[PDB]
From Swiss-Prot:
Region feature 3'-phosphoesterase domain (PE), mapped onto this chain: 1-127
Protein name: Multifunctional non-homologous end joining protein LigD
Domain notes from UniProt: The N-terminal 3'-phosphoesterase domain (PE) has 3'-ribonuclease and 3'-phosphatase activities. The central ATP-dependent ligase domain (Lig) functions as an independent domain.
Additional notes on this entry: LigD has variable architecture; domain order can be permutated, domains can be independently encoded, while some bacteria lack the 3'-phosphoesterase domain entirely.
Listed result of changing R43A: 1% ribonuclease activity, 16% 3'-phosphatase activity (in PE domain)
């Protein structure tokens, strides 16, 4: 019921935008190296600006001098296993994803370091959907848009 989406943003530096609907907006993290199904791998996820729910369906171009083009790399629904509001606040989200590419449980983990609160890490939870990185790299295996 709660919408999630991952956008592949080919800007100056390639990266993935990981979005989770909550309270009528999309909580968004910029994940430079993209999500990983390997529970042993920790991917940087820099918290960024909230985006409107309809942006989840956006494919196109962020104008030059402002930044490349964007596709919806994955989409579906997400479910928090623990209170999401208190989760973002305390700096830890335990949640499940139900989409095209990413599925199973995940963790968003924020650093405790003062002056670095935008620094999180996206880690795959050990479950049936977990896949070793050297056997299955979801970025390589499923590289294209789910809308076009
Ligand atoms: Mn971006
Ligand atoms: Y509180
Ligand atoms: Y399918």
């Amino acid at each position: 019921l709660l919408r999630y989406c991952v956008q592949k943003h080919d800007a100056s530096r390639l990266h993935y935008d990981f979005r989770l609907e909550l309270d009528g907006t999309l909580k968004s993290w910029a994940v430079p190296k993209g999500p990983c199904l390997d529970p042993a791998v920790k991917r940087l996820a820099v918290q960024v600006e909230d985006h409107p729910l309809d942006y989840a369906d956006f494919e196109g171009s962020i104008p030059q001098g402002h930044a490349g083009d964007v596709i919806v790399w994955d989409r579906g629904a997400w479910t928090p296993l623990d209170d999401p509001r208190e989760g973002l606040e305390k700096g830890h989200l335990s949640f499940a994803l139900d989409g095209e590419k990413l599925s199973g449980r995940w963790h968003l983990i924020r650093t405790n370091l003062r002056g670095k609160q935008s620094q999180w890490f996206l880690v795959k939870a050990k479950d049936g959907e977990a896949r070793s990185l050297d056997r299955f790299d979801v970025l390589k295996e499923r590289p294209d848009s789910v809308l076009s």
